[PDB]
Amino acid sequence: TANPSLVLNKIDDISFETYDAPEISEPTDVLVQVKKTGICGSDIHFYAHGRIGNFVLTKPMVLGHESAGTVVQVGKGVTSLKVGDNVAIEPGIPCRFCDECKSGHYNLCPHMAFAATPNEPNPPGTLCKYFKSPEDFLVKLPDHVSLELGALVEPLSVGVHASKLGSVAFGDYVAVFGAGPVGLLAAAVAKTFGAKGVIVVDIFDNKLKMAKDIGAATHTFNSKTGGSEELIKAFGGNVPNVVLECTGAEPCIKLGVDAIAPGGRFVQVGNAAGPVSFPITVFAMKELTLFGSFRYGFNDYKTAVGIFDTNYQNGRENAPIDFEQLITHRYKFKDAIEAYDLVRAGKGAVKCLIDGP
Amino acid sequence: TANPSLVLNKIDDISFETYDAPEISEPTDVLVQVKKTGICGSDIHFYAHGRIGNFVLTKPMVLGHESAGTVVQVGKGVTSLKVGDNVAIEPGIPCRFCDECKSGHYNLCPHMAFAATPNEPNPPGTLCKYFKSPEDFLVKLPDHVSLELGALVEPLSVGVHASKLGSVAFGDYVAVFGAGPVGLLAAAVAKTFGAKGVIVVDIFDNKLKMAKDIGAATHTFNSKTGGSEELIKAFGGNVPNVVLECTGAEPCIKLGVDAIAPGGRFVQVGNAAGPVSFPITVFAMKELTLFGSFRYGFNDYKTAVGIFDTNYQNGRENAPIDFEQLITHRYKFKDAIEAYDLVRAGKGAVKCLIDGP
Amino acid sequence: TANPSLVLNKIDDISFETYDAPEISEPTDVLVQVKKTGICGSDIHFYAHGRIGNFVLTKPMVLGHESAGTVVQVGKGVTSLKVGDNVAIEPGIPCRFCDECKSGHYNLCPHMAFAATPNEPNPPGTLCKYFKSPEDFLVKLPDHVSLELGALVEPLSVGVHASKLGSVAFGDYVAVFGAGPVGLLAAAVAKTFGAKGVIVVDIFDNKLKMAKDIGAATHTFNSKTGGSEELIKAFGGNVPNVVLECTGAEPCIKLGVDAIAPGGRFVQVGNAAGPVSFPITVFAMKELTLFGSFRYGFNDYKTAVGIFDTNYQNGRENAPIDFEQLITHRYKFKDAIEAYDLVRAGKGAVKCLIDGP
Amino acid sequence: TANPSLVLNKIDDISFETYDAPEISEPTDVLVQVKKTGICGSDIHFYAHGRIGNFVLTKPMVLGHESAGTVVQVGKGVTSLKVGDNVAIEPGIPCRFCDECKSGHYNLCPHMAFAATPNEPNPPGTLCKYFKSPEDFLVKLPDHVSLELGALVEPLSVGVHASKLGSVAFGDYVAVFGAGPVGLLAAAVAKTFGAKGVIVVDIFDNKLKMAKDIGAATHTFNSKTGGSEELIKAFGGNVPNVVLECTGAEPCIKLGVDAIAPGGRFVQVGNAAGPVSFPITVFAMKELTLFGSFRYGFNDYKTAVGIFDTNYQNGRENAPIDFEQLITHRYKFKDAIEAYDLVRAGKGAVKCLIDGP
Ligand SMILES: [Zn+2]
Ligand SMILES: [Zn+2]
Ligand SMILES: [Zn+2]
Ligand SMILES: [Zn+2]
Ligand SMILES: [Zn+2]
Ligand SMILES: [Zn+2]
Ligand SMILES: [Zn+2]
Ligand SMILES: [Zn+2]
């Protein structure tokens, strides 16, 4: 009944506290011992500013939102997990009653309680020992899927939701903008879903080489080389069918619009700091479709975990994409702040994982 | 075998010429005596600059693209029209062979030969006496549908294609931006298709009153009053479900994005002069969908004509929307240049129609 | 805290009992005084056999499933209804947790607790005084929408769900098979949604005349006249675009398949007693699509109530379809069994309504 | 200018004739030397009866419809093939003008001129030396894709069109009924498109073992073992998501409906001799969707050829599915009738290929 936690109290203040362990109350409730936890731009954002958009921090918040754990207790009504399963954690829990939820878009639930987002008490975070989640928001991990990759499920589901919105199908030609963690996993999904070509675009040659090395990308393109024609030439002349915009920057959005084929599908997952200059008219003349993608929805976690399942079922040696390279740093729970400053400093970590207490 | 025509030779030079009448060649070909012709921003655009985007004028071009006529000759294989029917004219003819055509999107045919667009000879224009069109690109006009409204079919099909892309259905709440001709007809389609609310937004009080007067709009809003909350208040508190952007201006695009409901559908039909500042991130966080709409496609003309059919079948007195008010000026073929300068001067004409020779 | 109820105990045994009134427990719970209640083939089915399919009766069941009432009590969290609103009742409540619910298809919830269906205690029925329902499963009734029509919402939602599955849109040509209550309301939806033609098919000339009289059908056809060609001729030569099969009988299914246009949409809402002889190959050669329709889903009730709203907003005198003719008998709660035997005997009632205690 | 051909004159009469070689006329026309040709149930059907449905034979018909050849001549306007490419042949050519064609469904063109179907002269067949086809109805064959498999493209496209109608996507669980050529290729598509499970069902243990051996099926089930529960048990407990019905027989259609998950997608590609007994009501209660699949449409051939492309790009040794086993017999053009009687006798050939003259 004791629970150590990483906590962000105020700006640049991260401390280790110890709260009461969450207790099971609902019959579908499940208690999970968090073992791994990922880190992204949103974790350092609250650390540096305490505000993303209008999400603003007003109380001691418990941290962490890309985690995987082990079931340690279940309620009466749990039928999909026993005590002792490895689970990926879907951090955002919806109301199940609103019209967004009822329509199959708990995605956009206005009462969405997300892990490690502020604002009535603060929705709990996963950088603790004991996390409480409903049964249907944990995905059982296959035996060959690492407890590490369970933390990688969260940014992978973001890419699954996006490629689904873009209706990525066999023989497609997808252009993913941004060779960061999300943009890398997104390219891995497109190729997994059967795309004949997956070109990854960014300005870091190191990140582009990794895209090609893990096998998630068939082509790469450095966007300081030129415009749309060179991107097409770098793609073997194939003109992109879907554009997965994971960057949120004008030069990438602009480049993705000139390059994409008429009638192509353009998914927006990257977030800008504000408004951006947009080529609105060529968008119209090409009859493009812009999909705003926000986090992940129904079946997205299970689908992402299943990507790990089939990718690694015949051994890491025979795995078609080497997702584990996305882990460049590993830290114990004691060294958590050494990990946050590490990612805050941008030392060259694509993804950093922290163990549980 | 003699055909008078309105012709734009060079900038600000519009003259009356007389060319050879088009002759039937293909078995599906149909000759049409053009009787009415509409006028829009694109007609005055070529008049003033001779260039829209990269469509640039290099030869004497025959003018006109929103017309209706009477069948005066048919080929052997014509089975849907006899000599003497009233027809609306779909001005853009595609190749039928390319992958855009074959996929049901002759819309985006790269070989699209549109009427009164330059660039091999110039695709013919409708401001003449005898126009040549394939059989499947004319729509027979019901007896109660005016030969005038047949010219109005062209900007109405633009609104039909747009509301279809937006999947406008019963009980929807649509916000149309721009109370011009296209934006007016677009609102008429949304209400026709069963929208519970159709609010029209612009800055001209005259144009907003006309939207409400012809019955195409249930609400109106002048966009100098305020932002999204006032637009919602002007809509009876109903939050918009679909946004039909017929303006192409930043303040309207910006306003349509804050106002629209999460998961709403946003159709872009207005064209900007260049790039525009876009709220790309709230677009993502709301999981909106942006549809680029470009002209009209399969079944769009027939659907628009059918809107005239059912609107006017039980008499103009019982017609639910008074489309004829959209005709504020009428001109004979001799007074064509007096009509072009009239619309060029912006005297207050919503739509101006010119008779055939 | 006293609640009289109509109850079916065993076959042919219907009695009046008095149980304890349901009490509010959940914060979203709402107590409703049932004022009107409809009757259909399923109510008499359990009366005559006590079994529909594998739904079999094993305990005293409280009866009724097409009702409308008045709010008499609310919980803390209710925000969409105050004490005293007129509501239509959606009788089937889902679990909100299963994958069918989470995907936006509470429709197919395997834990669906429907009103007046057996099989742990029996889900309550509406033929009582005080009914308990969650807030989001009641639809507030506009002031001009009769408390009677609120009971008619249930079979109307069945038709809304069906026409949505069939993607009924403007200018469509719909053929509804079966001029009973459901088939009549289904035709009213198709015409409401903008169908250019709605032909109703059955063998009762009385029922066909009513379809045309209330204005829900533009054409009618008696299926003992002939086959598909006569059905087309009866439709003004227009070939059907959507087929709404509300009958469940072979001759109607067979006729709907020959008549429908290639690529047409065929919705199956009628239920057969067992397997039926089906023209499976012409189905394939025409590239038809068969939609199994089962009850109603998200937004279907609100949409049906909205059909009443807009149909009757400018007065019964100006209402485009006269839904009230569907009420041919009215009974007080005391005379409930006189009403069940009346509909059991098939005296000529299209829909019969019973008041609450 | 001389062209030998296999010809079916009357029932059981197949002879070798020599007609005039087809000459290029249209600028998009292409002349092809047919090198391989497949054989299916439709070829022997016309041989035995001279009638499929209402397709009835009234003249000497030139035979063959599953072929691949080599370009030997092109017209002026050909831009996608040079003289000397290996091509798969799409045998059915549409009008490009009708509403089915214009809507992107040349599939259902009422003027469809298919190869080796009767009824104005007889549309030509591919069992000759020189075949004439438009440019956009040939698919260039990658260098590693056998000229044999080009003949296999035709029954593979049938499976591509079907799995597309069923929206087969990653992680799906597909049940294909019928382990014949079409049903085998259909299973290969489902697994290719990313299905987590592809169970093939038939009554021939030989054919089921081949499904599993070429790797197109993860599970198999012999339908004389039992009903739906055993089919699920044979599938590892996974309940089917899509059902691909390639058989046209009642016991398979019946079994596919009980087995499929609620809301599942059921594609009908097999053809019955007449009407069949159908479980119409469980279809409704499960909210299934029945897709009639008829031949193949836009992009289906290119997609099928691309399946060969990616399947064999890293060598037959590393190919994930061994499509070539589907060729159990090979014949020269002289021994064509020995091949037709061979397949007519049902000696055990899954697919038989005949060389060109
Ligand atoms: Zn993150
Ligand atoms: Zn919610
Ligand atoms: Zn125009
Ligand atoms: Zn084209
Ligand atoms: Zn009922
Ligand atoms: Zn449920
Ligand atoms: Zn075949
Ligand atoms: Zn055609």
Residue numbers in the entry:
A (entry chain A), B (entry chain A), C (entry chain A), D (entry chain A): 2 to 120, 125 to 362
Please share excerpts from the published article on this structure:
Xylitol dehydrogenase (XDH) catalyzes the NAD+-dependent oxidization of xylitol into d-xylulose, and belongs to a zinc-dependent medium-chain dehydrogenase/reductase family. This protein family consists of enzymes with one or two zinc atoms per subunit, among which catalytic zinc is necessary for the activity. Among many XDHs from yeast and fungi, XDH from Pichia stipitis is one of the key enzymes for bioethanol production by lignocellulosic biomass, and possesses only a catalytic zinc atom. Xylitol is then oxidized by xylitol dehydrogenase (XDH; EC 1.1.1.9) to give d-xylulose.
The so-called PsXDHC4 mutant was previously constructed by substituting Ser96, Ser99, and Tyr102 with cysteine residues in the wild-type (WT) enzyme. On the other hand, the introduction of four cysteine residues provided additional zinc-binding sites and significantly increased thermostability. Each monomer contained a bidomain architecture composed of a large “catalytic domain” (Thr2-Val163 and Arg300-Pro362) and a smaller “coenzyme-binding domain” (Gly164-Phe299), with a large cleft separating them. The former consisted of an α/β fold with a similar structure to that in other MDR enzymes, and the latter had the characteristic α/β Rossmann fold. Analytical size-exclusion chromatographic studies demonstrated that PsXDHC4 formed a homotetramer in solution. The four subunits (A–D) in the biological tetramer generated from crystallographic 222 symmetry were regarded as a dimer of identical A/B and C/D dimers. An anomalous difference Fourier map using data collected at the K-edge of zinc (wavelength of 1.280 Å) showed two clear peaks within the electron density map of PsXDHC4. The second zinc atom was bound within a loop that protruded from the catalytic domain of PsXDHC4, at which it was ligated by the enzyme residues Cys96, Cys99, Cys102, and Cys110 (distance of 2.3 Å). Superimposition to the crystal structures of other MDR enzymes revealed that this zinc atom was equivalent to (inherently bound) structural zinc, and there was no significant difference in their binding loops regardless of zinc.
